[PDB]
């Protein structure tokens, strides 16, 4: 959490330099690459800080949880039990929360800077045009438009708006999708409320799991939560996702709340958006599978689609489907260093991650980013601090590549700590191989006292 | 008999009030279906909006959503499916009606559709920019009017006694509000169009025997004379069949505040 605050502080500093560079000044290319490198590092520390906390808590609670399901449980309380029962669903949501937090930090303060053309009514220009066409003085051209002003009229009549409202609807629907893509669904509801779409603000509440606490016959009176027809509402939202007459962003909004990955991927235009689309639907699909196994509904005669109810999920599969995609951007981002680390930390596969570090060192040693060698070192120190095993020949050669960076980017001093993190034979041999370069007498004495501040075997070193 | 007698402990007063309301919340649908099923048979092919409203006046929300998906009114089906408890949607329609009235966009929507939006928003009457009023209980019987009070104008958790008092607050003369519920009659006077023009002799307005029994359950000292009078039961002042058999159940339930002239007139 302090490593994220250090990286986030330097991302803040570098952003407060790049935002002050004149566009096209080619000196700032390294400044922008350093900003993105430490931004991807910051969120990779965020990912580590969640998933390895869950995995250590689970491995301390698993002796104890002899749970019993209640015969009268609601959808909410089946899912409250699922998120205790199921570390695959729980870790999959921690990847959704993580990816939604990345999109949130790219939105920041900006929500209230959105100028629309409409400023007193919903569809104000089409409403004005209809109020003008009712006047017997209309010597205007009759552009085909809607004649009704419910929000289904464009799709029921198959007629357009005028293009000011048709810009504002397209502007608004991207901002609503961008807020839901950031977990800010309550801000998407507030933006709908702010744009006079209290109707679309209500549709953005229909996915909520059902609960009536009063079923247990309490001592005072409590509110009823959610939607007891959430299933019929998801079937209806899936129908709004698959007609080509709906906007790509409105289809994606209802898809991200009804499991329709197939209509969501048509808007997910980063690696993070594409991982998010798989994980967001994987949780929603596994939640529907536990609910439709535990909540015995009666006389419901429509199905949720068998492509989504019959969906087998694994973490490995999601990171094969992310390599079968046509989206060339995602195929190029799914080859960069932090996106590779993010795949392996999500899988929990430290064994393949150390073969990635070996596959990188064996090709690129002298050319690797200094902050990536700092990260690779501190991730190996984090795993060792948790007692987690690593391919120690590669761990030694990452540490030796880092000690060779630390000598050659220019620091001398910090080498002692990054050398006492080795077995004594190797700590002695690598600190001696450093001191075999030290000719300045004042620097010699200083580099012995820094070893005596680091519990090193100074006597076998010298 | 069925939901309380399953319980192997003395059932809490709250659970008794809850299941007595859940039973009456079936009675107020079963009393409405044959008129809704005729109304829909007539309206469906001319106005699906009135047919959808009629289903909602019997709590047939599944059939209302089904007819809205069949008519091409899919956002009405979405809106109706979400209304089954969610107070946030009630307050969002409360805002949306306040928007459309102030912005004079109300007069650009169907009055029949505004009647559905007012019902869902929990508004018994809505006041438009034209100075038109939409009364949600207009043209209905007392049972659907009292069911609107029990399902749309009150929370899931309130008592029958509050729905029945809000219904009585809706058909009397006050100093501060117009009548909007129908003053609401025996089943032979329903649908008749009879706005009773306040008969200038009859100081007690006629009501249904089922309303008189709901008063006697709410108040142990409520009148038995209007409860046992055949005009509360049938279109015939000579049919005492139910009147005598109701009294010879109330006498067994230890109600004793009938007059001996009134028992003598019933028995004779």
Curated annotation (Swiss-Prot), chain A:
Changing residue 268 to Y: In GAMOS7; uncertain significance. It is found in: Nucleus membrane; Nucleus, Nuclear pore complex; Chromosome, Centromere, Kinetochore. Changing residue 181 to H: In ODG6; uncertain significance. Signal peptide: none annotated. GO terms for molecular function: structural constituent of nuclear pore. Ubiquitously expressed in fetal and adult tissues. GO terms for cellular component: cytosol; kinetochore; membrane; nuclear envelope; nuclear membrane; nuclear periphery; nuclear pore; nuclear pore outer ring. GO terms for biological process: female gonad development; mRNA export from nucleus; nephron development; nuclear pore complex assembly; nucleocytoplasmic transport; post-transcriptional tethering of RNA polymerase II gene DNA at nuclear periphery; protein import into nucleus. Keywords: Acetylation, Centromere, Chromosome, Disease variant, Epilepsy, Intellectual disability, Kinetochore, Membrane, Methylation, mRNA transport, Nuclear pore complex, Nucleus, Phosphoprotein, Protein transport, Translocation, Transport. Part of the nuclear pore complex (NPC). Forms part of the Nup160 subcomplex in the nuclear pore which is composed of NUP160, NUP133, NUP107 and Nup96; this complex plays a role in RNA export and in tethering Nup98 and NUP153 to the nucleus. Does not interact with TPR. Interacts with ZNF106. It is linked to Nephrotic syndrome 11: A form of nephrotic syndrome, a renal disease clinically characterized by severe proteinuria, resulting in complications such as hypoalbuminemia, hyperlipidemia and edema. Kidney biopsies show non-specific histologic changes such as focal segmental glomerulosclerosis and diffuse mesangial proliferation. Some affected individuals have an inherited steroid-resistant form and progress to end-stage renal failure. NPHS11 is an autosomal recessive, steroid-resistant and progressive form with onset in the first decade of life. Ovarian dysgenesis 6: A form of ovarian dysgenesis, a disorder characterized by lack of spontaneous pubertal development, primary amenorrhea, uterine hypoplasia, and hypergonadotropic hypogonadism as a result of streak gonads. ODG6 is an autosomal recessive condition. Plays a role in the nuclear pore complex (NPC) assembly and/or maintenance. Required for the assembly of peripheral proteins into the NPC. May anchor NUP62 to the NPC. Involved in nephrogenesis. Belongs to the nucleoporin Nup84/Nup107 family. This is Nuclear pore complex protein Nup107. It comes from Homo sapiens. The gene is NUP107. The chain holds residues 175 to 636 of 925 of the full protein.
Swiss-Prot record, chain B:
The modification Phosphoserine is found at residue 47. Signal peptide: none annotated. Transmembrane segments: none annotated. This is Nuclear pore complex protein Nup96. It comes from Homo sapiens. The gene is NUP98.
